[PDB]
């Protein structure tokens with residue numbers, strides 16, 4: 238299947254950087270505005286500022302789904318820059334932490350559906366993410382999230398065999414054999430749902446990563462979050478089945494959470510309950 242995606246090259250003059258959003262091992266992500274040349278539009282963007290950034294560019298350019306991050310372009314300056322759609326509410330892990338008290342069952346179950354859709358689309362592009370986690374989901378709006386961080390992503394050959402790596406989100410086989418598949422991604426989807434259902438708890442809080450492999454071998458798993466009916470917890474547990482072919486398919490995860498999302502309070506129990514254009518409109 239020849240990959241005929243287009244990689245757009247951007248001139249630096251086409252965009253203003255307005256303020257820093259975060260820094261470190263990553264470089265520094267600014268937020269800004271992209272004004273395409275002779276276009277009377279203005280697109281809000283994240284601008285992340287060598288081989289590693291290009292591999293990510295490659296993967297990101299080759300994807301196109303409403304629940305997976307839009308790569309707008311790259312700029313080839315002294316320092317390379319990835320330009321992507323600005324996701325104004327930030328990473329979902331922090332979002333659930335900083336709004337624990339005003340998140341409803343509807344949002345939770347929808348996020349679950351959307352993350353599955355993003356992942357199923359990646360399964361469709363023979364693409365394995367290898368780093369799904371609440372931290373790597375961005376929030377465009379509370380109604381709409383997208384999967385991100387393709388720094389570990391790999392194209393496909395029914396598995397991938399690697400040479401730190403984020404241990405507590407990892408499938409057993411991956412910990413022990415560095416084998417990664419779409420079913421490895423499902424295990425990670427499991428933990429991601431757990432993060433969301435506990436409003437951003439750290440999994441195996443205060444437990445060394447070394448001892449993780451053995452813990453899972455023995456049979457232990459993440460506890461049932463208080464808001465979760467057994468119906469929902471059962472889905473998490475199925476995602477953590479030692480035998481990868483026993484775990485659900487993203488496809489089926491979309492369906493189960495969809496069903497739950499039509500009667501959210503049965504499945505989750507929570508006391509309470511000018512020339513600007515967004516990138517999704519810029520084709």
Ligand SMILES: C=CC(=O)Nc1cc(Nc2nccc(-c3cn(C)c4ccccc34)n2)c(OC)cc1N(C)CCN(C)C
Pocket residue numbers: 258259260263266268283322323324325326327328331332335375
């Ligand atoms: C993990 C922190 C985070 O996401 N902060 C954040 C992000 C955005 N928007 C945004 N949009 C697209 C990509 C990114 C982004 C991607 N990466 C890798 C980042 C690293 C650090 C900071 C931001 C990013 N960020 C944003 O848009 C206005 C605002 C914020 N924060 C100021 C609000 C979140 N605050 C509650 C931490």
